[PDB]
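Quarterly update, task 2.4: 3-(1H-indol-3-yl)-2-oxopropanoic acid-bound model.
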Amino acid sequence: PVTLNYANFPPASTFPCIQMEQWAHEVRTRTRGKVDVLTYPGGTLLGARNMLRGVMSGQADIGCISLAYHPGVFPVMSVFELPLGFTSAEAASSVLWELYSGLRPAELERVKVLTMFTSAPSHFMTVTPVRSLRDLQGMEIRGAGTLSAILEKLGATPVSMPMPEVPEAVQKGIIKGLFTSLDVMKDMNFAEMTGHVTRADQAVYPFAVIMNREAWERLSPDVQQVLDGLAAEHAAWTGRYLDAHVQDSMRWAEEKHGVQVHTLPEEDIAAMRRSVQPLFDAWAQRAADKGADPDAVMRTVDALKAQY
Ligand SMILES: O=C(O)C(=O)Cc1c[nH]c2ccccc12
């Protein structure tokens, strides 16, 4: 029997940790006890920033990274931080894993990628109501990576930070809100901090579950095929869990904490779409600057969405 240490950064209650536990359960079951997983939620082994380097140095065997936390590092897979039209985490997660699987971009060659998944679409959670784009102007809102770039295009003031730092930043007035999926209203108790939600139907945050190359290579071919054979099913499972849980989270937030929900006017939604359009070109240019083929990437994103 081998035991793999799986690091994660956010609290045990949140979806990246929930999925980690489910994955560990399946690994134990499907390897008939040959592989065990010892999990470290809440950043006790590796945190959000040192996750990638700590898995690569072998301080942990496995880890969970939010790609948006690593600017410049993932020129190809960062396409999934653009608004690609997904309305559910289940579809986005499945297409993300298929894109990685089909392109295997060099940016991730130095780790083994065990599976991938995404958050649900991003919305605004704020301390004061946002009923129009006018209300967002100059407002300090948390994002990361290209999600922060989206905020800047919309006229907000992005402040980038990893999820575990967000509650204090809101509590202490460093930011006025955050831009991400609504599961955190419950799972991190933002319902008691940000009493206003504005629909945005925006981009998702992509994640990878990564494994130290040497740890992976120390696994037998039969155990490898088991972990590989879990990857696609688990991507979908994670998105599916999250989709349902987002609805539960908002129900609890509205009913038990009086959260107010707002929608933007149609004209603001159209203007919002136009203002973020140039980020696609900027993504493509960075990708090409790094030797990748963004036309091919977008052709594959389009095909995989159509297949779905
Ligand atoms: O990766 C991020 O920081 C996100 O905003 C995506 C996300 C949505 N819900 C979460 C719960 C815990 C950690 C990250 C996220």
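Highlight for this quarter: The pocket of 3-(1H-indol-3-yl)-2-oxopropanoic acid is lined by residues 10, 14-16, 66, 68, 119, 144, 163, 180-181, 183-184, 205 (CB under 6 Å).
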